[PDB]
Amino acid sequence: KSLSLIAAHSHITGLGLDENLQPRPTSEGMVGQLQARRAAGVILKMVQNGTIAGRAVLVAGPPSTGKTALAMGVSQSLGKDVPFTAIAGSEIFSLELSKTEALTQAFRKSIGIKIKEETELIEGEVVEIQIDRSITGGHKQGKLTIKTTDMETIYELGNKMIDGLTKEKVLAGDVISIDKASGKITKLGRSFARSRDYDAMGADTRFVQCPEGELQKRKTVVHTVSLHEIDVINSRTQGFLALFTGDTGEIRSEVRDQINTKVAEWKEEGKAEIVPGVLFIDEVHMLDIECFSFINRALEDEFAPIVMMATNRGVSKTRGTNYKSPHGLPLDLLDRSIIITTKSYNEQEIKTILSIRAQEEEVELSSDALDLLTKTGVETSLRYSSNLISVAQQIAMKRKNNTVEVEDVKRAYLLFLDSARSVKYVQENESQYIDDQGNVQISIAK
Amino acid sequence: LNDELVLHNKDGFLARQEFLQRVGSAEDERYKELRRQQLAQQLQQDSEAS
Amino acid sequence: NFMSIVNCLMQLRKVCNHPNLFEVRPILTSFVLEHCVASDYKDVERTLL
Amino acid sequence: TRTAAHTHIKGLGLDESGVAKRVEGGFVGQIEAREACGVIVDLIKAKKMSGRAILLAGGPSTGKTALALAISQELGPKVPFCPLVGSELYSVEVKKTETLMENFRRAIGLRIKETKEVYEEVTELTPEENPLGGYGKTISHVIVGLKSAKGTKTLRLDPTIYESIQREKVSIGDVIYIEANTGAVKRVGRSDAYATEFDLETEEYVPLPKGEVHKKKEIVQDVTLHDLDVANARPQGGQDVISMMGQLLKPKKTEITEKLRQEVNKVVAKYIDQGVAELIPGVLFIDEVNMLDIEIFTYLNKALESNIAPVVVLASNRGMTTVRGTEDVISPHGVPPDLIDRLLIVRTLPYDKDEIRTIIERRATVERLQVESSALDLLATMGTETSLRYALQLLAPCGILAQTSNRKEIVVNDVNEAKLLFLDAKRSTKILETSANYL
Amino acid sequence: TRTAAHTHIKGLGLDESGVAKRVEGGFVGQIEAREACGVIVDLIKAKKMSGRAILLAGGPSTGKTALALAISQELGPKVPFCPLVGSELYSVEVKKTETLMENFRRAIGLRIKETKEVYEGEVTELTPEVIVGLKSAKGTKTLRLDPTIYESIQREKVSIGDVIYIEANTGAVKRVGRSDAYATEFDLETEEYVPLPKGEVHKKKEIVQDVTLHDLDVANARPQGGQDVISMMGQLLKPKKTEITEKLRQEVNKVVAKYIDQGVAELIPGVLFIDEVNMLDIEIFTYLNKALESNIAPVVVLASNRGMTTVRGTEDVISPHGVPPDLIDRLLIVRTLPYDKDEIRTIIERRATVERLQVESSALDLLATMGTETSLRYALQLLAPCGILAQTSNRKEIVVNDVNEAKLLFLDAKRSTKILETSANYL
């Protein structure tokens, strides 16, 4: 599943580590950042333990150095059943929701709850359905014979079940399951039994299902929901539609505190399980000082998932102020957060990453082509080469050779411009563009 | 009246017809899948209940 | 498609028919997708309530 | 079994006669602040005099939020407590002052008492006719019977209740509880008496209730006037026009008028005069108040002279700053001087090395961890050298590293490696200023 | 035959070997730009990568939007396309980033097929629950149907002996009219009697229609095609456009993935084009970094005729083309060159030909000289008034005197600025 063509992080697969939390030099589609990997694994173990809440971790470093890569790696290594919410800085400035309300909604999104509902479900292949009318003797007549692989028996109606079965046009001889605690018919498919008469359905029922034999089965159902879903459901008459449309509109706080108390009650009763989800925010330097102030308090609550942040700049002006604060963040948050630093890459690491992208993008790279690509990447940037590799393919089989060579790389380099060369050309051709003061020289002559 | 021919034939009668042939091949392969599953079930039942 | 004894037959059909037989314009209607978002979400909300 | 920088503070730890020892309630140091705040708890518990404010000032990582949480713990779970931050006052749905007014009303609660007599299988039902008028048809009376457990009893009623129970879609043989106050009755379910009526069914088995035919129970409810006035303003009902419209209206809260406030105040006043209701003033907490604005501050004064103003407590850490909204007003803690004149100030002081070391010991103990003596002693060293909170957060990664090499306790080299792995603010900004690659 | 600054661009005119000629496809010059554009054309035609970013930058009157239209036309109509201007992002109903995502989800197409089931015939009887009786040219069937469409038929004032058309899948109800078998019942009846349909009442057909993901999302979130009272009564309650939750997008992605995995549909990536991106806010610009680095986002192309400028939303950083370095790093740059005299003359004569105007060679020389003197767009704009001025004297050709008269009549930027500088009251 998970339809996708190609992602900028399609190669990273859940970090790479040993049992001793030691990162291998090359594991699961990434190279380098040993200390950062070890710190990420430490945080992953924290999340697995689930005994700690409301911890702030910040990832810092130069741009294009495994920041979002590390975030995706920890997200993948986290696996299912642990909520993970990745949010950009600019997704909260909405005219429909207050900024603190949106941050609250995200925090409630990143809290996993496991519940177990027990229902007595009966399944098995049927032969026909008996639905009778009201007569003098009693309410109705009904005797369902149900067959399975092992043993076949008969049951009777329940007055309401005639209406339930007549709600839909149930064909005779299908595998339908009934939970008497709910009464919901689950027409999974037709009765397998013998497929000689059931060999040409014309698709349908997805190859039916082989009956399991025994019928009296009570299997627990595990359902995973987050606090946001519960409060949104409680808020309105039909909260699910609001959940699927996003018109919640500033949910009231007393509902939230009641939900907190009631889920605590369920946790003590053993009915519910709490999963410490993760909230991730990118380029948080785009946030406002009000958001930082709200975070400063929302962190200390017991229902506070581990929050990871990544920025690019350093010593910048925090939005909403006029002083160039260090790291582009308020100082108190820097005090309350733990900083993870990422360092610059090496030519060997960049060449390994380029080869990983090549094998990921079905790109066959010649050794000299790899050398030239690594030289270009170390000269300008990782992403420049990481895009030139993909673009040079089209040139490769525009000359009908599947494997790329040096000439295709040279053509791609001479066809698509680099930031340094582009800025040099722009500076040497300042009169040709639009100035910051609206000064344009359209006329070539005079 | 030349450019419009090449702007219309990109998705014309033949392309849509060939796409319908593709989906026909797909559903025929699905029927083949159903047939092999059914016959395999028959072989399994020939030894699990005889 | 080597054979051509009827390769002009479709041309004749094209000329005489004027694509009112090859493909006529239908009564346009939207997609009829039926899975629904709330197909597997009533159980959870019912249990929660 | 999880904590986030708190939940180890168990009250204020103030003994009788208003005295605070060293180690109690997970609390160490800052005795005088605890004494003052305990006095504030006493004043709130007096429930005689309301409308005060108190702001406490200090540096970062001082325990202001801890102080407020200690207050809330000491008061107990009966009096309402509404924590808040300055930012949440801003909204895109109503005015800032209005939202302040909902919070103001939310702070104070009220406990109400009321007794209810309820009647609780069903033996039979039968209506009793000529309307003696232009009406089509009706029943003069309706006689029904309830089985219950503590004996059965028949019941005579009006065809209105017969209609209501018919709308409830309840079988003749079934368990029913009927409200004597207004007549509202809901289907309890299929009683246990008529078990396995057929082979398969879906109705709940609903074991028959054990009790008298009619039962009287005492109900005590604790609500705030904020629930009261929103309940008054919001419409209710079923199929009536405004009921469906409100059901589809997306009920955004909008600008509760003062007429509801006057009406509910009158009603609760006459109820407490009758002696059925008791009003419990609450305390409202605004953390990090520097983020407020001039309009909020002026309306805060106006609401502070109000009639039913709850005691509020404020927190800040700013100094000789300029209050937001203006630029010519430089005031302490970013609070306008007119507001400052209207409340008291509680001072808090930074800890020492010994106090930080004791905090580390307490925090290690609560999380069920073992710390070596030398390791704890060095943890105090960069606790004082860098910050208390950095060393407080460092503990969990150290525990993880100890788990790596299969050792419950924490050693010196483990915390050294942990410090090397994760950087503090000073080291981070040192790297930021040293490099020139946009970092 | 309306012509407006374009429609003379019939494509890049690139060779199958990836070498562009000099004059072809209504294009002259810009060989490097055309070659790179064709390379990007084959890139998108590969339909294997996603979230790629290309920016083409150059001064005004360099055919940047012309190049974008050229690549769009070369791709064809199978691929989805949606031109955009940066200022269109700012809205008042929804946040800007949500509109950006909405336009992201409208830039990828889905080709789907489904079977349409219909029932048409003569109205015979209406038995309440609801059962109906249909009469065809030869067949006749009785149908039991939901009371909703029964009430719709009642609202549709359907009489006895009428002929109706029903779409089974959507419950669409439409009455064709009344059968001509019972037609001349009245001398001047207003109802238009129609002949009986031919064929079975039950009919099955196949469609191959195409939709985009944004269409699926809005259809799921907002149903706006109902027929019974409840449907449009509900849908008229919330006319304002709202936000779309990400979980809805994930659910839609899951269902389309299932559809393509089963084998009744395939995915078609597309192109998103934003023109004059220099004015975009900083928040949207930093949002593009997250939006692009995804799995489904299509390729995007930007245009910006700027230099050392400060991006909107900040006041400190001066960046090339009004784009901060963070977005520059994940960007490919295409350089466009200014034209020259002979290319200007060729452009002018080609534009005249596409405007079916007769022009004399000396007039073309004068036009080229003036265009070099002031601008190409000036001459392109003023050539048509020259044509009408010649037409006034009943001449189908263009004479130098006519062009000089038109240039006297209509001003340019430099002359207007010079007049403004020496003006009494800011004329």
Ligand SMILES: Nc1ncnc2c1ncn2[C@@H]1O[C@H](COP(=O)(O)OP(=O)(O)O)[C@@H](O)[C@H]1O
């Ligand atoms: N360790 C790594 N292994 C493989 N690819 C990497 C690694 N680190 C970075 N990259 C590449 O860098 C890109 C991520 O850049 P990133 O560091 O997230 O930018 P920013 O610093 O702005 O967040 C990805 O496309 C990925 O291909």
Ligand SMILES: Nc1ncnc2c1ncn2[C@@H]1O[C@H](COP(=O)(O)OP(=O)(O)O)[C@@H](O)[C@H]1O
């Ligand atoms: N005397 C104390 N005993 C226990 N914990 C304390 C004490 N003083 C401060 N703390 C810790 O400090 C944290 C509160 O910091 P606080 O002083 O509220 O920060 P600020 O000054 O920014 O409001 C709490 O998590 C608490 O564990």
Ligand SMILES: Nc1ncnc2c1ncn2[C@@H]1O[C@H](COP(=O)(O)OP(=O)(O)O)[C@@H](O)[C@H]1O
């Ligand atoms: N090679 C060409 N062939 C035909 N017309 C061109 C060519 N180059 C530029 N033009 C014309 O120049 C004009 C400038 O195009 P556009 O990119 O929209 O404006 P700008 O170049 O100022 O951004 C277009 O109207 C186009 O018709």
Ligand SMILES: [Mg+2]
């Ligand atoms: Mg990144």
Ligand SMILES: [Mg+2]
């Ligand atoms: Mg504090």
Ligand SMILES: [Mg+2]
């Ligand atoms: Mg242009």
